[PDB]
């Protein structure tokens, strides 16, 4: 069981593929853009995964798959999974009480809560890597 094959223009890390996309998008349109590529906005679940993303991240910032779902107060990844790993900037997301709901990744890799209608130049998609057959 060796799964590290990724489509063209995707970078592998462990058992996932990652797409570092470009072009100005609001969070909801970045979300559609990943769905359109048979993926989804990235979910982050370890220090190791964050390291990898931080290395390939855009300095101008980028959308990730975490949002304050239906403004209920709890942050959930687009794939349905809960927050275990977190890499918040200092004070975040408590200092964000003016209606910020969508989470972006800075150049430093740190997460900050943003207004969902903010237009960012970058956004990250993920998906499972495919495996080479028992050959």
Residue numbers in the entry: 158 to 292
The authors write:
The second principal receptor for IgE, CD23, is a type II transmembrane glycoprotein with a C-type lectin-like domain (CTLD)4 (3, 4). In its membrane-bound form, CD23 consists of three CTLD “heads” connected to the membrane via a trimeric α-helical coiled-coil “stalk”. The interaction between CD23 and IgE is critical in the regulation of IgE synthesis, which can be up- or down-regulated depending on the oligomerization state of CD23 (2, 9, 10). We have determined the crystal structures of the human lectin-like head domain of CD23 in its Ca2+-free and Ca2+-bound forms, as well as the crystal structure of the Ca2+-bound head domain of CD23 in complex with a subfragment of IgE-Fc consisting of the dimer of Cϵ3 and Cϵ4 domains (Fcϵ3-4).
As predicted from the crystal structure, the introduction of the S252A mutation did not affect Ca2+ binding, but unexpectedly, the D258A mutant was unable to bind Ca2+ even though the aspartate forms part of the apparently nonfunctioning auxiliary Ca2+-binding site. D258A (auxiliary) and D270A (principal site) crystallized differently, and in all eight and seven molecules within the asymmetric unit, respectively, Pro-250 is trans. Mutation of Asp-258, which faces Pro-250 at the base of loop 4, to alanine results in a conformational change in loop 4 and a reorientation of Arg-253 compared with the Ca2+-free derCD23 structure; this was seen in all eight molecules within the asymmetric unit. The side chain of Arg-253 flips ∼180° and projects into the principal Ca2+-binding site cavity, occupying the Ca2+ ion position. The re-positioned Arg-253 side chain forms two salt bridges with the carboxylate group of Glu-249. Occupation of the Ca2+-binding site by Arg-253 explains why the D258A mutant fails to bind Ca2+. However, the crystal structure of this mutant, in contrast to the other three structures that all showed perturbations only at the site of mutation, revealed that the D258A mutation (at the base of loop 4) caused a major reorientation of Arg-253 such that its guanidinium group occupied the principal Ca2+-binding site.
